Design a protein around this ligand. Structure first.
Ligand code: PVV
Lengths: 92, 486
């Protein structure tokens, strides 16, 4: 059910930083647990991950600094709605 | 003496922002500048990417000045709150902007205030998460104003410009022409709500506390609308997001922009509206706006769908194709609310679903459908009950190739009538026929167009341009339904 998305404008793309967006009614406790689960499953595969921020208030989820290789593993995690690769925004 | 931009937004009759607070998500700002001194609170929020001292504050100071400026501002002396999401080069991240928007909501939940206006004078590529964050912040009761973009492209391919809940603003000059930022320029299309002054805009300069600089861009344009909305919400604090959007469109200047600058196919989708403050005069009036759906494509099964706001009523539905190869349109109900669906025919590149979304409170609206009669009389359906008015006619045909309160269609096509029970509403049908590529019929002053359709010989389609019904062909008759408050 979970899908991956990245910016269509290739020079504006920021690989290595991902926004994991969870289901509409996912609670903050579940969001943090899903982030720690990702870190645990990624540590077993020999990959180092960093949870930069945990989202709550508007959308449930978290900001993770990890290798793209873990995306398939991350899309399989519970409560995951979609994952988006971070991208640049510019002053108009 | 008075800057050109502040005069354009001034209505033909006239006489803020204490009650309303305006959040700015741009670069760092010179809070000590005399133009914005004591009225801007720097949150000192920082989530900016690494740069690869006065040049940093340049973009944010000007915009804070365009919004709350004492001498050159739209909403003079308005309470402002700035969040830094863009670095010294005016560059940020989607993630940083998400944390920025979350902070505004967290601040709102901790210490609630009155109406809130969030100005996002930035743009990146289409972002699913950023558009979703903008949607949820709008659901919460926050007004979001964004820049269309300076890429001389369709605003729908940029974020937060394509978020349906936000107010996307394009830029125009003193000649009411679209701004040309060197090689590029202002963005356009169905995602743009309206335009606002965005060329040679004088505002606060970060160089010195009293200095002034002239700047151009969709950021400057969006800053005018953020200021206009802050004053509109100061006058009417009970305004919902659908209400404010309808007010901005209704009080805007019409047919002033020369469509020539925009690509042919985008000329129609792009709204010819230039932002303006409301006049002194404005009981209740009927507000309507034209919504254009995303191009359906080359799929016959996948159809173009035009939607309205949850507190907005769909009063009519029409369809368009530049080739004229379509299978009509339908007013189908979905999840308790009406949607406008457009069907595509064989050999047709695609179709547009054009809907008329109106603010109609204390009124009950329904759809009256009739399948093909296959007889000489033609497919007909009518609003039978008393106190009910016809607002729009839709017609779709599954075939490959071909009176008051009544919808008339083709014998091989289905017909859809929109009937509303509004006792304080007077509706009329205005028609115009010519034996020519374009036929127009317009509602008079004080009357709001609710329905636009073509009398059933080959037609490209029909669309509403403000209170004028436009029918495209290669006789041809344009049908307009004009309504008003009695
Ligand atoms: C991706 O599609 C759109 C995107 C956008 C807008 C409109 C869009 O489609 C019609 C408008 C013009 C606003 C608008 O009308 N909103 C609507 N909400 C629900 C139905 S219409 N500015 C923001 C971007």
């Amino acid at each position: 059910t979970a899908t991956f998305h990245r910016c269509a404008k290739d020079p504006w793309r920021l690989p290595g930083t991902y926004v994991v967006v969870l289901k509409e009614e996912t609670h903050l406790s579940q969001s943090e647990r899903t982030a720690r689960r990702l870190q645990a499953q990624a540590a077993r595969r020999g990959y180092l991950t960093k949870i930069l921020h945990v989202f709550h208030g508007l959308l449930p989820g978290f900001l993770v600094k990890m290798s793209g290789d873990l995306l398939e593993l991350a899309l399989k995690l519970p409560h995951v709605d979609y994952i988006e690769e971070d991208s640049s925004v510019f002053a108009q």
